[model samples]
Target: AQLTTESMPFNVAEGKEVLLLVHNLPQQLFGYSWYKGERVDGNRQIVGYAIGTQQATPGPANSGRETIYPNASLLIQNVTQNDTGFYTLQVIKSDLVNEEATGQFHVY
Candidate 1:
């Protein structure tokens, strides 16, 4: 199985750092994506995505202080009131076509 993690109830302070961890325990993943949403288009879309850890980093929509590490870490640097929201991590395994594993996060 593979897993991803993100801390909850983050402070509303700007530039705060939020981290998500991806654990591949007895499973292999081919792609990864980070989303801040209750559902697709129901909230925020993916913030970062990569096929592998080597390609892990901020997604196309991210800019400025928002950054991502392919190793399953997202650095908000300094968080702001606007940054308060729910976050989700999605992992796609090579064998599980059209299926994904996910984790959720909430920031105050």
Candidate 2:
């Protein structure tokens, strides 16, 4: 089967925690990457990833407050208004696969 990413739009209250997931892919994934908003040019966060049986590592910006699951999901702790926006997920499976999905996060 082809690689893919999936997520549903969700809302969270101020100061709440949230989890964004990328579903439907192989278990032995190479890595996972995440981006914010429409542009892929800037504001990219590595989030969390595992490679070749290694443990997952959180990106620099996501170290303390955010966690990346083995399933390519992202968990954000203590979210606020600043965290509300469009988030894009990119699955680095292979050169042939263009697995990407976007989801909206609304905080009120």
Candidate 3:
């Protein structure tokens, strides 16, 4: 099994809302995290969503306009050029195993 996205490179205009949709999410998840860059890091994480308690915690990189849905889709409100780059999605399973995927963004 593999993690995937709903669409390809997003070429969106600045100030427009963006949706980073995911596909084939695993079962029995503990939570998931979304990072702003190509890899996960303390300052690059935008959000960490908890599946057990159904909560979303903002990370250091959070733009204050980002949100994630239950399905692992990320929504960025009023995005700017700062939002352009690769995004990483890491899903944590209840068994303590983790999986991840990547998506790209282009805001002009």
- Highest TM-score model number: 3
| True lDDT of residue 30, candidate 3 | 93
TM-score of each: 0.62, 0.73, 0.93
The global C-alpha lDDT for each of the candidates, from Candidate 1 onward, is 0.53, 0.64, 0.86
Report model 1's TM-score to 2 decimal places: 0.62
User: Residue by residue across 4-104, what tens digits does model 2's lDDT show?
Assistant: 34433377887888888665766435777776664343335646455555466655445366776767777877887777887777766755354666757
Arrange candidates, best lDDT first. 3, 2, 1
lDDT of 3: 0.86
Is candidate 2 or 3 superior in TM-score? 3
Full candidate order by TM-score, most accurate first? 3, 2, 1
C-alpha RMSD by candidate, in order: 3.8, 3.2, 1.5
Query: Which tens-of-lDDT digit does each residue in 22-60 have in candidate 1?
Result: 465225757556665444432355464555546644454
Pairs in steric clash, model 2: none
